[PDB]
Amino acid sequence: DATVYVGGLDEKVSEPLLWELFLQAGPVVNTHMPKDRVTGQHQGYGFVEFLSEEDADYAIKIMNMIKLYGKPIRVNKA
């Protein structure tokens, strides 16, 4: 479970408000939030690696409680 997939975001969000955002729950050890080079903008889906698995399963339970730009945020195991 150490990693999660996160959908439905707005590009003003970046890797930092994800950092800050999910460490509110529990620390994101490895952050991945693609920067698209071609048009220089984000599609808004994320992958998160944690310290171990327990962090991330609690993360499955609590985690789908973040609303990014008035809008819904997908978090599921991976």
Partner: protein, 229 residues
Amino acid sequence: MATTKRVLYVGGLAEEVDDKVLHAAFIPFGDITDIQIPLDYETEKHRGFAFVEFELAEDAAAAIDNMNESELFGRTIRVNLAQVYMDIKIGNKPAGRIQMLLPMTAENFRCLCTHEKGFGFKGSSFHRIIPQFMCQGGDFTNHNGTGGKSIYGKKHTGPGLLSMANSGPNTNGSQFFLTCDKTDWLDGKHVVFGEVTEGLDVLRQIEAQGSKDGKPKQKVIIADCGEYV
């Protein structure tokens, strides 16, 4: 021979007149005791007539003689002798009630309807709605997707079935979905645990707010919920 002279029949009502309008000002003893009217599950809009009950019979007869051919809302109305639930609100409008028939999975959902463990569904939303697929909620204090918690800790043959949302095997919390078609590709991946017994029409009103990407066009709220017990 009968004593059913309490329920009065009101006709020629307006599109704005409802059980409330008739209560504070109906034909006989309408606003009093109990009132009946044509209410939908999603639309929840009265036609023009209805039935009002009076605490007594004399009061009802007096209400008819008067309200008879009276003037309401600039119109002439006629008066004469005549398992758990979720109440859904869509935008600012009541849509109606869904009734559901529901061991560990059923007990979790039951407690989340009653709030008997100190938290539950009341006031939460259906945050992901996909037409011809499903309406997902139970992210009570989340309003995302697979957010919430079970009563135990953190963790498809046709329309109108209840099934648990999850984030993989053995990750049930509080999130659930109501199916809007046969969704057999989810068999063996999500735990089905109940069925709609009344208010499939209200579920169709929720589905009407869906989009292909799941974003609700209007807020869909569980205005109230509980158990029949």
